[PDB]
Design an enzyme around this catalytic site. Structure first.
Site, PDB file in Angstrom:
ATOM      1  N   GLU A 131      10.585  -4.597   5.319  1.00 41.04           N
ATOM      2  CA  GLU A 131       9.777  -3.584   5.842  1.00 41.04           C
ATOM      3  C   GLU A 131       8.193  -4.365   5.877  1.00 41.04           C
ATOM      4  OE1 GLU A 131       9.286  -0.028   6.663  1.00 41.04           O
ATOM      5  OE2 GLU A 131      11.239  -0.663   7.657  1.00 41.04           O
TER       6      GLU A 131
ATOM      7  N   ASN B 223       0.932  -1.198  -0.075  1.00 38.22           N
ATOM      8  CA  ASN B 223       0.060  -0.078  -0.045  1.00 38.22           C
ATOM      9  C   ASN B 223       0.949   1.327  -0.133  1.00 38.22           C
ATOM     10  OD1 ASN B 223      -2.339   1.230   0.121  1.00 38.22           O
ATOM     11  ND2 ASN B 223      -2.299   1.309   2.167  1.00 38.22           N
TER      12      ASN B 223
ATOM     13  N   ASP C 200       6.041  -4.551   2.741  1.00 31.59           N
ATOM     14  CA  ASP C 200       4.794  -4.088   3.111  1.00 31.59           C
ATOM     15  C   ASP C 200       3.600  -5.203   2.937  1.00 31.59           C
ATOM     16  OD1 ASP C 200       3.526  -1.278   3.755  1.00 31.59           O
ATOM     17  OD2 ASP C 200       2.238  -2.107   2.385  1.00 31.59           O
ATOM     18  N   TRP C 201       2.361  -4.777   2.729  1.00 25.51           N
ATOM     19  CA  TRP C 201       1.353  -5.853   2.623  1.00 25.51           C
ATOM     20  C   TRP C 201       1.668  -7.009   1.590  1.00 25.51           C
ATOM     21  CZ3 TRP C 201      -2.285  -6.906   5.805  1.00 25.51           C
ATOM     22  CH2 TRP C 201      -2.616  -6.060   6.787  1.00 25.51           C
TER      23      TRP C 201
ATOM     24  N   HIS D 256      10.493   3.404   4.464  1.00 28.56           N
ATOM     25  CA  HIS D 256       9.654   2.488   4.377  1.00 28.56           C
ATOM     26  C   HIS D 256       9.450   1.731   2.878  1.00 28.56           C
ATOM     27  CE1 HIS D 256       6.381  -0.389   5.167  1.00 28.56           C
ATOM     28  NE2 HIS D 256       5.636   0.155   4.215  1.00 28.56           N
TER      29      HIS D 256
HETATM   30 CL   LIG Z   1       5.756  -1.634  -1.693  1.00 26.59          CL
HETATM   31 CL   LIG Z   2      -1.265   0.018   5.311  1.00 28.74          CL
END
Ligand SMILES: [Cl-]
Ligand SMILES: [Cl-]
Length: 291
Positions: A122, A33, A98-99, A266
């Site tokens: 991350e 995200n 991330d996700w 990030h």
């Molecule tokens: Cl990403």
């Molecule tokens: Cl998120």
């Protein structure tokens, strides 16, 4: 050359970037995200020489379709599963942030033999308190606001704060105007921004939502027992993953090497694409030669 293709998936379509020789192992790149396969554009060409690179846009992101769904984590699980089946991928390296890491961890927990190796950074993990989320007071306050009824709708649906603030604010270098035009292209309307609001409300924090929290606890228990090769990249200070946390996390997994990239926050692909791409490519070449 990178090709942007489309594949009918469930009730919609998914776009994906593709390159590399088709007789090589598949590497599946999973963004989070509020990015898309575009975030891998400077990494994929460096892995292409040793692998068949496939980078989907998650449903509702990038150039993928926008079906009328909640865009919960479990929705992304279904569409990604369907995408992998439709392309006939039977095994793959996973490269994820991330996700995308939650999707990768849950895929590996359900089908351990599918994973040739996991390169991640991350990443999402169950966070028992808000003190376990991220590192900065401003991030903690902002994500608390995302998860507040009404307030989150105003910040993300009306003002597009995840795309316009969290993304460039969580990268060290300056994004060009063209790069930000790409990243905001999927999200020109309040309704189109629903997936970027649902994701922070899916983050497993203080036991909520309970289904995601339980699912990622199981995924992380499988990860801790797994023995397929792994790469953990970290930035400094990082965001969801500090250097000190990355060191302990990797040292407590089996078969996980730690790669210290240097200055990063990030979205590490935008600060270290060549280091990530070259490291992944050499790691795959090592594993493939060892067979
Ligand atoms: Cl990403
Ligand atoms: Cl998120």
């Amino acid at each position: 050359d990178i090709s942007l293709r489309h594949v009918s998936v469930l009730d919609s379509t998914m776009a994906y970037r593709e390159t590399g020789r088709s007789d090589a192992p598949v590497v599946l790149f999973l963004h989070g995200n509020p990015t898309s396969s575009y975030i891998w554009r400077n990494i994929i060409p460096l892995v292409a020489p040793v692998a068949h690179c496939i980078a989907p846009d998650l449903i509702g992101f990038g150039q993928s379709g926008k079906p009328d769904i909640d865009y919960r984590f479990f929705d992304h699980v279904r569409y990604l599963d369907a995408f992998i089946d439709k392309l006939g991928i039977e095994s793959a390296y996973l490269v994820a942030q991330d996700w995308g890491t939650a999707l990768a961890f849950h895929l590996a927990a359900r089908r351990p033999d599918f994973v040739r190796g996991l390169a991640f950074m991350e990443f999402i993990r169950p966070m028992p308190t808000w003190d376990d989320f991220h590192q900065t007071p401003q991030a903690r306050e902002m994500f608390r606001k995302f998860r507040t009824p009404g307030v989150g709708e105003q910040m993300i649906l009306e003002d597009n704060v995840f795309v316009e603030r969290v993304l460039p604010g969580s990268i060290v270098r300056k994004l060009s105007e063209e790069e930000m035009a790409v990243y905001r292209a999927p999200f020109p309307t309040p309704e189109s921004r629903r997936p970027t609001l649902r994701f922070p409300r899916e983050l497993p924090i203080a036991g909520e939502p309970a289904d995601v929290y339980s699912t990622l606890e199981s995924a992380h228990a499988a990860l801790a027992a797994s023995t397929y090769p792994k790469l953990l990249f970290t930035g400094d200070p990082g965001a969801l993953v500090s250097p000190a946390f990355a060191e302990r996390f990797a040292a407590n997994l089996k078969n996980c090497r730690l790669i210290r990239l240097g200055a990063g926050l990030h979205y590490l692909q935008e600060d270290h694409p060549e280091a990530i791409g070259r490291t992944v490519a050499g790691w795959i070449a090592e594993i493939e030669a060892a067979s």
